């Protein structure tokens, strides 16, 4: 009976212990979520001076329980079925012609503040590579997230490729593969095969002098 928590505005808090090629950092977002309209506003600040990668490199890592499932789709809203006890979101991201990220996280409630707790380890990246080179444009397209049930794990499996527009013109591919698993032993929901239309707008707080990211995102469910 979890989706009952998501009927209004629920503040988000996201913490990211981060390391790529031994270049370490930690990021701290806070904003809000409106399930109803699928709306997501966030300001992400870099604790530690400057980021070794370019922010887009993982908007995807930095709360899919904040998606609008249409009333005719409620029966397939897994992420809210796990709540408040929450789910583990395990993801591996191979960046074609470059190394890879490896991320675990516990999205759960804490009083009222839904919190995404992420550790993320990265390897094999060439130190000219578009990623470490900072050649990627400070933007982001819309993408389709494909959900398929997995009664094995008791939860769901997910896939989606991301297009990063390079400063040159060409597109850096990112192959995302994602398992989600409830932390609770309470009743959850297994979905039919369906996708999420995730749209996302990056920008910069003019006062803010710390390496940071304003992200505003619309995500809705479709394919049934």
Measured distance CA(74)–CA(221) in Å, rounded: 10
Tokens describing residue 201: 């707008």
Adjacent-strand bridge partners of 213: 44
Judge contact between 121 and 144, C-beta under 8 A. no
Distance between first and last Cα of the chain? 22
Experimental method: X-ray
Domain 2-222: which CATH number of 3.20.20.70, 1.10.8.10, 3.20.20.80, 2.40.155.10: 2.40.155.10
From the list 142, 129, 132, 137, the residue with the least C-alpha distance to 168 is: 137
Measured distance CA(104)–CA(221) in Å, rounded: 24
Judge contact between 126 and 98, C-beta under 8 A. yes
Domain boundaries, the chain: 2-222
DSSP the chain: -GGGGSSSEEEEEEEEEEEETTEEEEEEEEEEEEGGGTEEEEEEEESSSS-SS-GGGGTTT--GGGSB--TTTGGG-HHHHTTTT-EEEEEEEE-TTS-EEEEEEEEE-STT-EEEEEEEEEE---SSSHHHHT-B-S----EEEEEEEETTTTEEEEEEEEEEEBSSSSEEEEEEEEEEEES--S---PPPSEEEEEEEEEE--SS--SSEEEEEEEEEEE--
CB atoms within 10 A of CB 95: 21
Adjacent-strand bridge partners of 200: 217
Tokens describing residue 64: 């899919």
Rg value, the chain, Cα: 17
Indicate the pairing of strand 39-46 with strand 212-222: antiparallel
């Amino acid at each position: 009976k979890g989706e009952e928590l998501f009927t209004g505005v629920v503040p988000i808090l996201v913490e990211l212990d981060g390391d790529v090629n031994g270049h370490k950092f930690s990021v701290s977002g806070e904003g809000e979520g409106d399930a109803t309209y699928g709306k997501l506003t966030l300001k992400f600040i870099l604790t530690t001076g400057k980021l070794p990668v370019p922010w887009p490199t993982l908007v995807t890592t930095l709360v899919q329980c904040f998606s609008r499932y249409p009333d005719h789709m409620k029966q397939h809203d897994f992420f809210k079925s796990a709540m408040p006890e929450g789910y583990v979101q395990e993801r591996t991201i191979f960046f074609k012609d470059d190394g890879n990220y490896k991320t675990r996280a516990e999205v759960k409630f804490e009083g009222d503040t839904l919190v995404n707790r992420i550790e993320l380890k990265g390897i094999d990246f060439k130190e000219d590579g578009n990623i470490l080179g900072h050649k990627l444009e400070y933007n982001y397209n819309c993408h389709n997230v494909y959900i398929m049930a997995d009664k094995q794990k008791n939860g769901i499996k997910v896939n989606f490729k991301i297009r990063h527009n390079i400063e040159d013109g060409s597109v850096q591919l990112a192959d995302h593969y994602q398992q989600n698993t409830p932390i609770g032993d309470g009743p959850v929901l297994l979905p039919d095969n369906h996708y999420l239309s995730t749209q996302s707008a990056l920008s910069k707080d003019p006062n803010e002098k710390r390496d940071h990211m304003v992200l505003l995102e619309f995500v809705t469910a479709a394919g049934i």
